[PDB]
Design a protein around this ligand. Structure first.
Ligand SMILES: C=CC1=C(C)[C@@H](Cc2[nH]c(/C=C3N=C(/C=C4\NC(=O)[C@H](C)[C@H]4CC)C(C)=C\3CCC(=O)O)c(CCC(=O)O)c2C)NC1=O
Ligand SMILES: C=CC1=C(C)[C@@H](Cc2[nH]c(/C=C3N=C(/C=C4\NC(=O)[C@H](C)[C@H]4CC)C(C)=C\3CCC(=O)O)c(CCC(=O)O)c2C)NC1=O
Ligand SMILES: C=CC1=C(C)[C@@H](Cc2[nH]c(/C=C3N=C(/C=C4\NC(=O)[C@H](C)[C@H]4CC)C(C)=C\3CCC(=O)O)c(CCC(=O)O)c2C)NC1=O
Ligand SMILES: C=CC1=C(C)[C@@H](Cc2[nH]c(/C=C3N=C(/C=C4\NC(=O)[C@H](C)[C@H]4CC)C(C)=C\3CCC(=O)O)c(CCC(=O)O)c2C)NC1=O
Ligand SMILES: C=CC1=C(C)[C@@H](Cc2[nH]c(/C=C3N=C(/C=C4\NC(=O)[C@H](C)[C@H]4CC)C(C)=C\3CCC(=O)O)c(CCC(=O)O)c2C)NC1=O
Ligand SMILES: C=CC1=C(C)[C@@H](Cc2[nH]c(/C=C3N=C(/C=C4\NC(=O)[C@H](C)[C@H]4CC)C(C)=C\3CCC(=O)O)c(CCC(=O)O)c2C)NC1=O
Ligand SMILES: C=CC1=C(C)[C@@H](Cc2[nH]c(/C=C3N=C(/C=C4\NC(=O)[C@H](C)[C@H]4CC)C(C)=C\3CCC(=O)O)c(CCC(=O)O)c2C)NC1=O
Ligand SMILES: C=CC1=C(C)[C@@H](Cc2[nH]c(/C=C3N=C(/C=C4\NC(=O)[C@H](C)[C@H]4CC)C(C)=C\3CCC(=O)O)c(CCC(=O)O)c2C)NC1=O
Ligand SMILES: C=CC1=C(C)[C@@H](Cc2[nH]c(/C=C3N=C(/C=C4\NC(=O)[C@H](C)[C@H]4CC)C(C)=C\3CCC(=O)O)c(CCC(=O)O)c2C)NC1=O
Ligand SMILES: C=CC1=C(C)[C@@H](Cc2[nH]c(/C=C3N=C(/C=C4\NC(=O)[C@H](C)[C@H]4CC)C(C)=C\3CCC(=O)O)c(CCC(=O)O)c2C)NC1=O
Ligand SMILES: C=CC1=C(C)[C@@H](Cc2[nH]c(/C=C3N=C(/C=C4\NC(=O)[C@H](C)[C@H]4CC)C(C)=C\3CCC(=O)O)c(CCC(=O)O)c2C)NC1=O
Ligand SMILES: C=CC1=C(C)[C@@H](Cc2[nH]c(/C=C3N=C(/C=C4\NC(=O)[C@H](C)[C@H]4CC)C(C)=C\3CCC(=O)O)c(CCC(=O)O)c2C)NC1=O
Ligand SMILES: C=CC1=C(C)[C@@H](Cc2[nH]c(/C=C3N=C(/C=C4\NC(=O)[C@H](C)[C@H]4CC)C(C)=C\3CCC(=O)O)c(CCC(=O)O)c2C)NC1=O
Ligand SMILES: CCC1=C(C)/C(=C/C2=NC(=C\c3[nH]c(/C=C4\NC(=O)[C@H](C)[C@H]4CC)c(C)c3CCC(=O)O)/C(CCC(=O)O)=C2C)NC1=O
Lengths: 177, 265, 164, 162, 177, 164, 152
């Protein structure tokens, strides 16, 4: 709902101010690294299908009680809902990475998720292992550190975007715990 | 009488003290169903096993008396139904299964009045075993090329599950409180044999393609091998991890040192 | 849980009426079937270890490429997860034989099957290669009665059309 | 937990105060002791395959009835033997966490909290675990302040068992 | 019933491929260790009767449930059967080592073994425990690290055959469980 | 399968015992004869397309009656198949020069040979005319070494000793 | 994913800790000890010019040392091949990479690595235990020629 550009114009709206020197320098740096921001987002959505299967199966192989009779992922209808509950999570994090602001997954995904999972019976102590696995996959893709897939990129460094996407993935585990 | 199956048939010729147990364990695998034996099952059948050493008793009469001993009777005669016993004599001596059910209804009739000895001698004295090899041939699961029935392809080969292996005709290696067998080839009159003992009951010849190894480690050059497992007891702990490869740095001639920018002109 | 009783008390609660003889004549047929439909579920429960083993060994034997590396039948624990995946399906057809209808199948195994085998790369062509063995591998004079095998073979074909 | 960094924050947080010089010297005393702590944690980690199965046999030599007496509480079965070796691995891993953190924080919340009810219920004796802990204190094979820091957390686990 | 000389034959028959010079370079290593291959197995079969007695006694010293009545080694009929089961496992890992191939190990004595054992009622976990003692003994002999009884040998190492024996023993435990 | 390995350990398997020094002494001949055998293998494998070129018409030179109508190879869709069948046999002897036995020969070639050569009216004498023409084209200084020649030639007349 | 190692521990994990702790130190020697015998690379027309071909050689020594240290950690040379050796010759001749430099620079790593685990480095000495890592020293000598025979 808000991007990095509109974040600035509501802070200078409180001051009844224009935009000048010190407030445009950090915004031109967004445009400067803007090609790397597109170049990192495409690295996630190109192979997001295997990122939600490995992350759900990583939670199950750590917690074998989730596929017990009486486990939360026991039948096929509950398992297939899990396989898309984690894809909705990955869709909104890639929106906040693209827009450069965490005010889109805060509004349409995170607000009220804790009260929703405790109503349905979803274990929230096991929903956070599925996101922390997906945090490790997403930072091992915008840096070429994936063990079984290497992607061509221009030379340079992207550890600032690795800390940006790790701030989004941690607040999903902070909004449901 | 053509195509693939086994050719080696042990014949027990002119037998001296080391070609005894070359064929004797092949006897004890075949007629005893690779079970376990070898004290007073081998104190037990001593009075026939010494007899076939000068050729005074043939191999035909040896198995004829071995089935009359209670190694066989205490393993394949008490913990068995009437259908299981006709099943096992076709396996152990004849190397096949029952070709039809009136052959079964013959053999359980022959158990019912003439006894157990007269039944098991009739398993010999047909022209099946003599057409197999004769007296000196060791009983073995032979394959015919041209079979007269595709039920009798695997009426024969749902007996021999794993001759190359372990097939356990009793419930252990001649277990102590012997549970009854189930006579698993029941098959009354007009039916076939199921598929589940065909593909496990064929020998190592039609195994045409094999599997392929995958590559073992990660192919992304900026590696991250955790590989982390190293189990001590339950306290599973991470080894020599080799982090990452980092990108280097940025040479940025801020100094520049080119011809002066402020030429005041 | 679509059964004969749950059909009519939900048709009547839709209209908002009392159970008439369009609802009492339906449960009479539930008596005219449970004398033979419960006979198959009595046999299947005490025999299922010999059936689930014969069902999977008629799947991997035909689909022998699944044991290659890179596939979905890699290790022994995946194949041990393949008999667990089938002994559910022989349990869910046991649960459908006692509720009368197709209640447990179309909301525990079927509902959501298209996304849990497409995501985890599980071939839906191998499942029908094992269940059709059990249907083809049926024999009504010895193993059952002639009226159990009419309806026991009718629920496996509910799986096969819903898996294909 | 009970790190000296978190027990200096929670001291200044309970007073509504910024971090004064009383708290920064508590942090700097952790940093001085740290290089004798992080080497004992590194030394016990690699030498864990010997120190666990060496200490499991030290219990069976002093208390040989725990291998012969029938029952679920004794290690007279393979299930009970493998759960006895699991218990010594809990005590050693908690010591390496207390060396890395510094101070008896991790083994207080993970191990000693509610342990007297567990031993009393499942009939298993704390004197078995003391003989295993005195083995590791006698055979970790360090010296200097690397041993004096490592023995300070073995002796904390013994003082909670008695 | 195949071997390592035929292992490069049977795949080349599957594409009707003539075997070249570069294909037999693995067999050039296989004739290079031609004394080294026999240098391993004569330590194994020399200590084989000690090996199978040390393996099953250490299997049952840790697990006294089998010597409990109703176990699986309680009776001497069971007990004489039990280490007679173990020596055939010892006999065929040597048979696989003579061929340089995992061929003899599984076409005989291993196909049909898991469904045999569940018809015996054999606890398969103790059979994993017995083979793991059988794996650890063999790599002590063929690297001459048997600290109870060393033997005289030649100069050098057998690190590759130490990996070969461990890659024969694992598929014993991988097939019975 | 007949190698050196496959006979002696199966005899030890029929003996049911450990491999003794009888079993170990037979393997010692492999490293004496790998310097004898496989030098003729890539000598074949670099020359087999020309070997089948000169041996495939040697039976045509001895037997011109095959190109008459009503015979075995009489049109060009079988004359390439005439060269194809003998190309299997040079590929087969290339395999048993590796394994040091007659393993691939009497499991793929001779196993099941004479039935189809009888029932398809195939001249068995015209088979070995291509084989005997390959047996006398050896040059023990030129082609391979002297001991590599008789390792090669003894397999070739074994085919004639199997086809006749 | 466990690395499947059954016996004789605490040396193989100690061998790789003496290699990847100075893996950037080893590559910076082999990217700089190459030049004193072949100085045509920073010559214009060489394969190490305009400050990116020098930087792409830093990625090349890193991905050939991590994929041989994963081969040391597994103990088998299988993931030396299944992510690295499948067609690595066909990218170098199609690029014009000289094979004389790559066959000599791997032997710089071979002489460096067998001094590390035998503790015969002339600069730094590890505080290692008492024993021998010389069965491992034959293993890494039989690992640096597998890429010495692949890149030929
Ligand atoms: C018991 C079951 C079990 C698993 C399934 C795996 C699951 C798994 N994968 C990763 C970790 C990862 N998983 C991926 C995912 C992928 N790599 C690709 O190239 C594909 C696109 C995609 C799989 C098809 C990536 C890129 C990483 C990070 C780097 C890596 O490990 O390769 C992690 C991270 C560890 C953590 O932080 O907790 C876990 C648990 N591990 C397990 O224990
Ligand atoms: C419409 C779709 C679209 C894209 C996908 C990107 C594609 C893209 N990426 C970069 C260019 C780049 N991309 C990266 C990013 C990275 N490099 C790495 O080594 C890391 C793996 C990763 C960090 C996240 C870097 C560092 C540059 C160099 C240029 C720059 O920093 O601006 C460039 C400009 C220079 C070039 O490569 O030619 C382009 C067009 N841009 C687009 O317009
Ligand atoms: C008396 C009853 C009788 C039959 C009904 C047939 C059927 C039949 N075929 C085979 C066995 C076989 N049958 C075939 C035949 C064919 N495979 C094909 O792809 C073609 C369709 C067809 C050739 C025209 C082959 C190739 C084998 C395999 C032989 C083997 O595995 O050793 C067997 C087991 C015996 C054996 O292995 O030889 C039987 C019973 N043969 C019989 O003896
Ligand atoms: C040619 C292939 C071949 C094999 C692989 C073995 C396998 C094998 N073992 C047994 C039979 C047996 N195997 C065992 C062994 C064990 N049970 C345990 O619980 C222990 C863990 C383990 C000992 C190490 C025992 C105890 C029996 C006899 C069980 C009984 O009392 O019936 C039998 C049945 C015949 C018999 O009972 O003697 C077979 C075929 N034998 C073979 O002929
Ligand atoms: C509860 C579900 C259930 C089934 C669906 C069947 C399935 C089934 N059939 C057989 C077993 C068999 N199935 C048949 C087939 C037939 N028998 C005939 O006489 C007919 C001609 C034909 C009917 C199609 C035969 C001949 C056997 C016995 C062959 C054997 O020994 O395996 C077996 C092996 C065990 C046994 O010996 O019975 C099983 C599990 N059994 C069950 O318990
Ligand atoms: C679709 C419409 C439909 C119905 C309305 C019912 C009608 C109905 N009721 C009964 C039959 C019966 N009903 C009762 C019930 C009672 N008797 C008493 O004396 C008690 C006061 C009362 C208890 C509630 C009894 C006792 C029987 C006899 C059957 C039996 O005893 O099991 C029978 C069986 C008659 C027989 O077989 O002889 C039928 C068909 N069934 C239907 O299918
Ligand atoms: C109660 C209802 C219920 C079901 C219907 C099944 C459905 C099902 N199967 C699997 C999971 C699986 N199912 C199989 C089985 C197979 N895979 C194949 O490729 C073959 C076609 C087939 C062999 C018969 C395998 C091998 C896995 C594990 C795949 C993996 O994650 O590695 C999963 C994922 C959870 C898990 O990993 O266990 C689910 C929901 N499980 C259930 O709990
Ligand atoms: C997962 C991480 C991990 C490691 C990095 C190693 C590190 C390590 N190795 C040993 C222990 C040892 N380490 C060595 C190794 C060596 N001695 C030499 O003479 C050579 C120079 C060098 C090998 C290259 C030896 C010989 C022992 C003692 C024998 C043994 O414990 O196996 C110990 C226990 C002793 C101690 O340090 O207190 C540890 C922690 N082990 C691990 O678990
Ligand atoms: C409770 C009862 C109990 C036992 C019976 C033994 C059994 C036993 N022995 C060894 C371990 C071993 N066992 C042998 C075998 C032998 N050594 C020789 O030199 C002889 C020739 C041969 C028969 C004695 C060898 C060579 C080792 C390796 C260590 C060593 O060299 O001793 C191991 C370790 C295997 C492993 O960790 O996987 C065990 C459990 N240990 C026990 O705790
Ligand atoms: C049939 C009987 C028969 C044997 C038992 C072997 C015995 C054997 N191995 C090697 C020879 C060798 N043996 C090794 C291997 C080893 N040396 C060791 O100290 C390790 C324990 C072991 C690892 C398995 C190496 C590296 C060589 C040298 C290479 C070779 O000659 O093959 C040699 C030649 C050197 C010598 O004369 O001692 C002999 C005779 N060869 C045979 O013909
Ligand atoms: C792979 C196995 C292999 C062989 C069996 C030979 C067979 C062979 N020889 C030659 C070609 C030749 N081969 C010879 C050799 C000889 N001529 C003689 O009269 C002597 C008996 C013998 C050794 C002096 C000579 C001299 C030529 C050239 C002229 C000729 O064909 O005779 C050619 C090339 C085309 C052809 O002429 O047929 C081939 C395939 N070469 C091989 O590579
Ligand atoms: C429009 C889409 C499109 C493609 C994806 C490719 C696909 C493709 N690649 C190759 C062909 C090839 N591709 C390569 C690979 C490479 N070559 C090098 O110089 C590098 C080292 C490496 C890139 C990393 C090589 C070496 C060949 C030649 C034959 C081969 O080895 O496959 C061919 C055969 C003819 C040709 O070269 O075009 C085709 C159709 N071609 C296309 O027209
Ligand atoms: C421009 C000229 C130039 C060179 C010729 C090389 C110098 C060089 N040094 C070593 C030899 C070595 N090189 C290293 C490498 C290093 N030592 C460290 O501590 C660091 C991790 C890393 C580089 C700083 C080590 C550890 C040895 C072994 C030295 C020893 O025996 O202690 C070797 C291999 C053995 C040999 O053939 O001599 C070479 C070629 N470096 C150069 O710059
Ligand atoms: C991380 C902190 C932590 C501790 C300290 C802990 C102890 C612990 N030890 C237990 C059992 C056990 N502990 C033992 C151990 C022994 N008995 C003997 O004879 C030996 C002398 C001794 C081993 C040295 C045995 C045999 C059992 C099984 C008792 C039973 O299940 O009834 C149990 C019961 C559940 C189980 O593990 O099976 C707990 C909770 N658990 C924890 O989570």
């Amino acid at each position: 709902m808000l991007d990095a550009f509109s974040r600035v114009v509501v802070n200078s709206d409180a001051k009844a101010a224009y935009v000048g020197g010190s407030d445009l320098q950090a915004l031109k740096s967004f445009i400067a690294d803007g090609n790397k921001r597109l170049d990192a987002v495409n690295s996630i959505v190109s192979n997001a299908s295997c990122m939600v299967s490995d992350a759900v199966s990583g939670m199950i192989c750590e917690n074998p009680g989730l596929i017990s009779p009486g486990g939360n992922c026991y039948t096929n209808r509950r398992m297939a809902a899990c396989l898309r509950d984690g894809e909705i999570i990955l869709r909104y994090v890639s929106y906040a990475l693209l827009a450069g602001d965490a005010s889109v997954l805060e509004d349409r995904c995170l607000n009220g998720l804790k009260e929703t999972y405790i109503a349905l019976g979803v274990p929230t102590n096991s929903s956070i292992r599925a996101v922390s696995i997906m945090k490790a996959q997403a930072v091992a893709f915008i840096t070429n550190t994936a063990t079984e897939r290497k992607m061509s990129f221009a030379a340079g460094d992207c550890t600032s975007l690795a800390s940006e996407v790790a701030s989004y993935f941690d607040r999903v585990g902070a909004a449901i715990s | 009488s053509s195509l693939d199956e086994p050719e080696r048939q042990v014949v027990m010729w002119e037998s001296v003290g080391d070609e005894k147990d070359q064929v004797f364990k092949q006897l004890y695998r075949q007629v005893f169903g690779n079970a376990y034996l070898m004290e007073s099952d081998l104190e037990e059948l001593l009075v026939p096993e010494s007899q076939l050493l000068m050729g005074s008793i043939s191999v035909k009469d040896f198995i004829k008396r071995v089935a009359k001993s209670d190694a066989y009777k205490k393993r394949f005669f008490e913990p068995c139904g009437p259908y299981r016993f006709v099943e096992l004599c076709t396996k152990h001596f004849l190397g096949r299964g029952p070709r039809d059910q009136k052959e079964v209804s013959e053999h359980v009739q022959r158990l019912a009045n003439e006894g157990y000895d007269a039944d098991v001698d009739s398993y010999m004295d047909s022209e099946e075993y003599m057409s197999l090899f004769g007296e000196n041939g060791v009983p073995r699961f032979v394959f015919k090329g041209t079979y007269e029935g595709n039920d009798q392809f695997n009426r024969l080969a749902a007996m021999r599950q794993f001759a190359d292996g372990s097939y356990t005709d009793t419930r252990s290696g001649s277990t102590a409180p012997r549970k009854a067998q189930k006579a698993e080839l029941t098959m009354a009159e007009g039916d076939f044999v199921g598929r589940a003992k065909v593909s496990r009951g064929l020998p190592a010849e039609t195994s045409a393609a094999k599997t392929g190894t995958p590559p073992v480690r990660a192919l992304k050059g900026p590696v991250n091998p955790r590989a982390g497992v190293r189990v001590r007891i339950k306290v599973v702990d991470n080894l020599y991890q080799v982090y990452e490869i980092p990108p280097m740095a940025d040479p940025k001639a801020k100094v520049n040192a080119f011809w002066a920018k402020p030429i005041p002109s | 849980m679509k059964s004969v009783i749950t059909t009519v008390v939900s048709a009547a609660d839709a209209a908002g009426r009392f159970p008439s003889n369009s609802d009492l004549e339906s449960i009479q047929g539930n008596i005219q079937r449970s004398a033979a439909r419960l006979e198959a579920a009595e046999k299947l429960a005490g025999n299922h270890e010999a059936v689930v083993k014969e069902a999977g060994d008629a799947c991997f034997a035909k689909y022998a490429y699944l044991k290659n590396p890179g596939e979905a039948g890699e290790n022994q624990e995946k194949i041990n997860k393949c008999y667990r995946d089938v002994d559910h399906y022989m349990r869910l057809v046991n649960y459908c034989l006692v509720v009368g209808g197709t209640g447990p199948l179309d909301e525990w195994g079927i509902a959501g099957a298209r996304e849990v085998y497409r995501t985890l790369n599980l071939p839906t062509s191998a499942y029908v290669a094992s269940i059709a063995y059990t249907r083809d591998r049926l024999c009504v004079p010895r193993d059952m009665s002639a009226q159990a095998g009419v309806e026991f073979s009718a629920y496996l074909d509910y799986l096969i059309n819903a898996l294909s | 937990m009970k790190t000296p960094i978190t027990e200096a924050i929670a001291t200044a947080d309970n007073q509504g105060r910024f971090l004064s010089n009383t708290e920064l010297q508590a942090v700097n005393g952790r940093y001085q002791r740290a290089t004798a702590s992080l080497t004992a944690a590194k030394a016990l980690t690699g030498s864990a395959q010997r120190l666990i199965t060496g200490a499991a046999q030290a219990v069976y030599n002093k208390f040989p009835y725990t291998t012969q007496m029938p029952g679920p509480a004794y290690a007279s079965s393979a299930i009970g033997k493998a759960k006895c070796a699991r218990d010594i691995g809990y005590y050693l891993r908690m010591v390496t966490y207390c060396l890395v953190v510094g101070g008896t924080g991790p083994m207080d919340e993970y191990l000693v909290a509610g342990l007297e009810e567990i031993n009393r219920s499942f009939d298993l004796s704390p004197s078995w675990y003391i003989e295993a802990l005195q083995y590791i204190k006698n055979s970790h094979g360090l010296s200097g302040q690397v041993a004096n820091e490592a023995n300070a957390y073995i002796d904390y686990a013994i003082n909670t068992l008695s």
